[PDB]
Chains A and B, each alone.
Chain A
Amino acid sequence: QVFIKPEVFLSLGIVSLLENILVILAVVRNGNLHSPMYFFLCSLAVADMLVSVSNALETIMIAIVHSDYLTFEDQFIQHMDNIFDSMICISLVASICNLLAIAVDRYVTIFYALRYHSIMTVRKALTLIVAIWVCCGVCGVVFIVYSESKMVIVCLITMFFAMMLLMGTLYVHMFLFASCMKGAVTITILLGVFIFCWAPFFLHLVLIITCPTNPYCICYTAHFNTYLVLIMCNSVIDPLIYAFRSLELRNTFREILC
């Protein structure tokens, strides 16, 4: 019952795409940002790229079909919807898994800071990254090809809720110390932006599964299209936190302009 002009979706998508392109090109063009913990921040950039590209393309297609220009063999629209609605179910499980991997790597380097170079090497990190993306690819397709059911929604709910518990545990550990003072402060922000942005949408579908026909909930979901602009704003914020908290990445950006 509320609407948002498509220009918002398109602009946010393009801007976040440019930011993530800059992050990945900066990592590759540099020779010191090749540590295995700095590749997970590239995999996260890829996940946010997926969200932005899919949303921009879906908006373009909806606006094109709405206008008086083509006819699209109804099966075909229902097919590209599932293509587009499936590079967001992948770029959610991938984001969750990558945040877990970053947190586990930081915990290993903070509490086991003796053989981190022996155990967590560059090649092993690459193997973990490719395994995570391969697994999340299947996870995000099985769900969307089987979305008519009710188990997928509740499974997503428990995934988000459990990762919320992990964030809370990490925070309560942050205030009781007994490298660490400044180590896990990044993954504390990156886990506090993902939750702040994917939370309004996520309880939106604990409601429709609990209180569909109820005059309170009904006027809650009625603002659905503005819980999706928040999902983009997680992808326009994440690359900024890397810039304002990692030093040598900033100096690389200076090389980008000159």
Chain B
Amino acid sequence: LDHXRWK
């Protein structure tokens, strides 16, 4: 996973 989305 990673922060926010559509990075």
Interface set of A (CB-CB < 8 Å, partner B): 58-59, 61-62, 65, 77-78, 80-81, 84-85, 88, 144, 147, 153, 201, 205, 208, 221, 224-225, 228
Contacts and interface: CB of A to CB of B under 8 A. Distances in A.
Main secondary structure of the interface of A (DSSP, over half): helix
A205 to B, nearest CB: 5
Interface of B: 1-7
Given A80-B1, A147-B5, 10 more contacts: A59-B3, A62-B1, A81-B1, A85-B5, A88-B4, A144-B5, A205-B6, A224-B3, A224-B4, A228-B3
Contacts, number: 33
A58 B1 CA distance: 9
A228 B2 CA distance: 12
B1 A61 contact: yes
Contact of B7 (A61, A62, A224): A224
B1 A228 contact: no
Contacts of B5: 85, 88, 144, 147
18 contacts: A59-B3, A61-B1, A62-B1, A62-B2, A62-B3, A65-B1, A80-B1, A85-B1, A88-B4, A88-B5, A147-B5, A147-B6, A153-B6, A205-B6, A221-B7, A224-B4, A225-B3, A228-B4
Nearest to B5: A85
